[PDB]
Amino acid sequence: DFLAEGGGVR
Amino acid sequence: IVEGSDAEIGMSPWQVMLFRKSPQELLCGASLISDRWVLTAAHCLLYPPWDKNFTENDLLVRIGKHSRTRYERNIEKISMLEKIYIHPRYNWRENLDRDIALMKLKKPVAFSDYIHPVCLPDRETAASLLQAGYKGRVTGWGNLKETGQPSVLQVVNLPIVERPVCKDSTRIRITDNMFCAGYKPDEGKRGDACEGDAGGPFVMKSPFNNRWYQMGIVSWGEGCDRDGKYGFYTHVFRLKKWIQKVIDQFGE
Amino acid sequence: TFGSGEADCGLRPLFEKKSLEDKTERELLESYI
């Protein structure tokens, strides 16, 4: 989890 | 871009803008590698968590621009998409590895003083230039801060970061297909790519031939211009076999 | 196309071609020593 671990797609 | 400055006309001739047909919106950036192939991030075209999933139809690429906004009359060229190609192994749920996609222009673009293509690196240039400390060029029309958009294309030069540091800044599972750049906390110089930037290029200029090579694709990060944090980019070199596969499969 | 690209890729009409440079390419060169 990109999101869960704070992932900020650009 | 955050902490960067106004581009210079014709300074980034491969800078391509991925544009939304309706709602007419800018959605990302990309680069020109031939007269009919454009490189961008897969997540620009398909990113579920956003219910993103466009077709070569909802879109347009705008080529040769400076203004984020003005219709640059004899200067820009509007192009349509023939096929869009997302990496068979692009992972959006987990770490964004292989965040890459090619797009074939329905028609080849005509080079000009504002339109011309960037080079993709060969084995050797990759080793040469991809070294902690060496600087890169990231251009975008993206946010001016984490949390607006510039009036003009922005540019920011930043240095590649060391693997371990990259890995130490984030909880995400960094893979062999990405790289990180931006200043370190102790270095007191800033700048970073921000939202509206992915697809856009990370370029470096070889001291051997004086050509610009595209070393990464603006991909992702936590925040923007954050101390202790690093902008992440797709390793163009690393994924070349595929760029090459799909190209001499579906065009040229 | 690809693999060290185009043919003339990398040489910008308004800069390397007319042997002039931008406001900050040198910062790159200096980053590489």
Question: Residue C28 and residue B137: Cβ atoms within 8 Å?
Answer: yes
Alpha-carbon span B159 to B2, nearest angstrom: 15
Beta-sheet strands, E only, within B33-162: 37-40, 59-63, 77-79, 81-86, 101-105, 135-140, 154-161
* Class of the CATH domain delimited by B13-117+238-251: mainly beta
Pairing of β A8-9 and β B212-221: antiparallel
3-class DSSP state of C19: coil
Chains C and B touch (3+ CB pairs under 8 A): yes
Q: DSSP for B67-89?
A: BSSS--TTT-EEE-EEEEEE-TT
Residues paired with residue B178 on neighbouring β-strands, in sequence order: B234
Q: Give buried/exposed letters for B57-76 (b at 16+ CB in 10 A, else e).
A: eebebbbbbbebeeeeeebb
Q: Does domain B1-12+118-237 have CATH number 3.40.640.10?
A: no
What is the CB neighbour count within 10 angstroms for residue B249?
10
DSSP one-letter code for B22: S
Question: Residue B218 and residue A10: Cβ atoms within 8 Å?
Answer: yes
Phi-psi map region of B228: left, alpha, beta (phi>0 left; psi -120 to 50 alpha): left
Structure tokens at B213: 């090579």
Resolution to 1 decimal place, in Å: 2.5
- Count up the domains in chain C and report the number: 1
**Resolved by:** X-ray
Question: Residue B193 and residue A10: Cβ atoms within 8 Å?
Answer: yes
Rg of chain C in Å (alpha carbons): 12
Q: Is B159 in contact with B181 (CB distance < 8 Å)?
A: yes
Q: What is the CATH number of the domain that holds C4?
A: 4.10.140.10
3-class DSSP state of B250: helix
Q: Is B193 in contact with B6 (CB distance < 8 Å)?
A: no
Q: Is B243 in contact with B39 (CB distance < 8 Å)?
A: yes
Per CATH, B1-12+118-237 and B13-117+238-251 having the same topology is answered yes
What is the CB neighbour count within 10 angstroms for residue B44?
29
Contacts of B204 (CB under 8 A, 6+ apart): B129, B134, B135, B136, B137, B212, B213, B215, C28
Question: Residue A2 and residue B172: Cβ atoms within 8 Å?
Answer: yes
H/E stretch holding B220 reads strand B212-221
Task: Give all chains having 3 or more CB-to-CB distances under 8 Å with chain C.
Answer: B
Domain residues of chain B, as ranges? 1-12+118-237, 13-117+238-251
CA B143 to chain centre: 14
Per the structure, the complete domain to which residue C16 belongs is given by: 1-33
B92, B171, B222 ranked by CB distance to A8: nearest: B222
